[PDB]
């Protein structure tokens, strides 16, 4: 996260760390959506152009964390993956269309002060909140600058951007399964996701029922925190029938 700040303890209890065991390194962010399901970006698990193709036994998840590196006794919980489900129409060849994947934990995780699932949006929540200028929150342990790793989880709040401005900002083909967020050059404020933040959540707090909803997944950008560039996020609501189909058929 560039130009964010340290998260407060317990601020993002659905935050999940996807950890590669060998070599021992942060792979990506992710989010807890129930006691046995974790949501992330497909490209965190499968990206053939960069020879990336992980299977369930290559990774472990760490839940409840704050420190990037310290073992958090009696706070964090480690989980193994039973099965990964990548969206069958995820477009790795081109633009990361449908950049979404679900991971089933072998054993359910116990909730606590530090571990708790985020909501997925219903139709009214999505309609009421997915408006240009409305801010969401991005969290992760990714790099602090484009060219630098944080000691603890970082957080930044960023406004959703109008779709024509998103499209003008990039040479990539932008689909209805993506939205973009970030400040414009004229707005003064800064902030962005960066490498290592991929797969983590973009959340918004509903003023109607006080609950946090995951509206996006950190998907891709061009550099980090560049003027006139924006981060792109998977449009969770638009893919929510797939999420439910997977959980209903395989949960």
């Amino acid at each position: 996260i560039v130009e964010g700040s340290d998260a407060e303890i317990g601020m993002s209890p659905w935050q999940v760390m996807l950890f590669r065991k060998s070599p021992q390194e942060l792979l990506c962010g992710a989010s807890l959506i129930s006691d046995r399901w974790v949501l992330t970006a497909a490209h965190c698990l499968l990206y053939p152009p960069w020879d990336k193709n992980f299977t369930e036994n290559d990774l472990l998840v760490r839940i409840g964390k704050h420190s990037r590196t310290r073992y958090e006794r009696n706070i964090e919980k480690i989980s193994m993956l039973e099965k990964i489900y990548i969206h069958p129409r995820y477009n790795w060849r081109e633009n990361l269309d449908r950049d979404i994947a679900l991971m089933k934990l072998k054993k359910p995780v116990a909730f606590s002060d530090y571990i708790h699932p985020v909501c997925l949006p219903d139709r009214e929540t999505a309609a009421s909140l997915l408006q240009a200028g409305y801010k969401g929150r991005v969290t992760g342990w990714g790099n602090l600058k484009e060219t630098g790793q944080p000691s603890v989880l970082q957080v930044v709040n960023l406004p959703i951007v109008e779709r024509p401005v998103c499209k003008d900002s990039t040479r990539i083909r932008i689909t209805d399964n993506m939205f973009c967020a970030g400040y414009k050059p004229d707005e003064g404020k800064r902030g962005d996701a960066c490498e290592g933040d991929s797969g983590g959540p973009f959340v918004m707090k509903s003023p109607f029922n006080n609950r946090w909803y995951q509206m996006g997944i950190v998907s891709w950008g061009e550099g980090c925190d560049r003027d006139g560039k924006y981060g792109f996020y998977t449009h969770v609501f638009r893919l929510k029938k797939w999420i439910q189909k997977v959980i209903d058929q395989f949960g």
Binding site: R163, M178, H235, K241
Partner: peptide
């Protein structure tokens, strides 16, 4: 105010790849 993303569902029924863009952040 303007919709940032469409309120509908992805259904069944090219362009430059991301990996060709210098400095692409995945």
């Amino acid at each position: 105010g303007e919709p940032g993303a469409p309120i509908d569902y992805d259904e069944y029924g090219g362009g430059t790849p991301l990996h060709e863009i210098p400095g692409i952040r995945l």
